[PDB]
């Protein structure tokens, strides 16, 4: 008998979620999720978005998710190279700017912001729950 | 084969923890925990305190926990009748005042405060994990 999620994670649906312990740039945020056998948050449904908006509703912190694009002309992609489903959220923030390390997306107050990937935010990691 | 804790709870050691979805007075907070076969947070150990302090470090909100006293001459007690373990935390704020519904403790980041039990706050529920 194994638990769906490790201690100190939140079990929701098929996944486990964990908030970072600090504020880091997007690349370091990505590395920390990978070291927990996880990835940065990927929002694939409105149900995913509702859950995360409630989970962060207690916090005014910015939280990186796994969404990035090299520059404004490029499409938004998750870490796995899959595209952003367009119906889920509008991206605010630095949507017209170009940065050397690219543009990355965070959620704050339930809304989604584009910013320079080298700047530091909290992050959310997710991984598959053990439901065998 | 059952999970230690339901969806939307956090499993930590022998317990499950839930952050309330609503902000209510302490009595109504307690009834919402009871409806989930749970009770208001009890901090039993320095390990429990470390865990809760890290869990709420994202939030500036007060969270009600299971600590109260009917009036300032009474001791602070958890809902189970047990006293506050020495050298865990100091209770700050107006510990001296008398309120119609009594005085209750909330935890906020690195501190615990006394407050009028009728004021509305988010709360933390716990219950035993299935192990």
């Amino acid at each position, epitope marked *: 008998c194994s638990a769906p999620c490790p201690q100190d994670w939140i079990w929701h649906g098929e996944n486990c979620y964990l908030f970072s312990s600090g504020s880091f740039n997007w690349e370091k945020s990505q590395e920390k999720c990978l070291s927990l056998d996880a990835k940065l948050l990927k929002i694939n449904s409105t149900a995913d978005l509702d859950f995360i908006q409630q989970a962060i509703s207690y916090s*005014s912190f910015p939280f990186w998710m796994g969404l990035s694009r090299r520059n404004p002309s490029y499409p938004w992609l998750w870490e796995d190279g899959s595209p952003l489903m367009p119906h889920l959220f509008r991206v*605010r*923030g630095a949507v017209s700017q170009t940065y050397p390390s690219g543009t990355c997306a965070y959620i704050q107050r339930g809304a989604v912001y584009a*910013e320079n990937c080298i*700047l530091a935010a909290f992050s959310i990691c997710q991984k598959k729950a053990n439901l065998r | 084969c059952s999970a230690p804790c339901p969806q939307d709870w956090i499993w930590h050691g022998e317990n499950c923890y839930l952050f309330s979805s609503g*902000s209510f007075n302490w009595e109504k907070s307690q009834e919402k925990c009871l409806s989930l076969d749970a009770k208001l947070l009890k901090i039993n150990s320095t390990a429990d305190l470390d865990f809760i302090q890290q869990a709420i470090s994202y939030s500036s909100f*007060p969270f009600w926990m299971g600590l109260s006293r009917r009036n300032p001459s009474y001791p602070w007690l958890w809902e189970d009748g047990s006293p506050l373990m020495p050298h865990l935390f100091r209770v700050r704020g107006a510990v001296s005042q008398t309120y119609p519904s009594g005085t209750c403790a909330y935890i906020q980041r690195g501190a615990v405060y006394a407050e009028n039990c009728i004021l509305a706050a988010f709360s933390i529920c716990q219950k035993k994990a299935n192990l």
Partner: antibody
Amino acid sequence: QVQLVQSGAEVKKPGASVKVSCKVSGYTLTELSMHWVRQAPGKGLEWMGGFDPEDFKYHTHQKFQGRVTMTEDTSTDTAYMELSSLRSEDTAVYYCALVWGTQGKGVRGWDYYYGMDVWGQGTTVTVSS
Amino acid sequence: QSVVTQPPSVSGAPGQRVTISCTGSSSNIGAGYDVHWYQQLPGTAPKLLIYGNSNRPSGVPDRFSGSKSGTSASLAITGLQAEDEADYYCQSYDSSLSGWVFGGGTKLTVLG
């Protein structure tokens, strides 16, 4: 660690304009969120304008629009506030203030959390004829 | 309701505790924006006292604290001393105005 030094006191006639300077030392202004705040004598703080991470633009309070211009000189690390059509009610201490909470390392959206920790010394503008 | 309001005056004796309420709306404190508090001693520039509802910057002592609840936030000062006599401003951001808003200010008198 960052300091803001403002230009000296000014006396102006109704109808004139004033331009207050705010020089940043210790870090580069292009990475930093500048605000302007004023306080008339015996009255409260009034936010005039500043950087908004919502859309990455400078906003001014509706109450001023037309009359306030905020500019930055990336070469001297100097911010400017210019207030035109001056009235007696504009007699006030003008303050520049900056959000230094993440020391240029945090996403700009941290601005809403950290507030204005670094303040210029203020500039007295007297509007009298 | 794109304003935040504060009472104009609060009073306490040295060693006592007082609170100052910042009352906002669904467009500022209730929209997920945090409250900051600024302390202005007689004849000085304002200084940041509390940020993000409850955080103390370096050199602000433990006896200032703050909290947020719904559309309001509160400043608490225990152990009042004479050097705390000052004007206190709350501040939030309002997404209906797309700008920052100060409360009217609260004069704190330490009864002498």
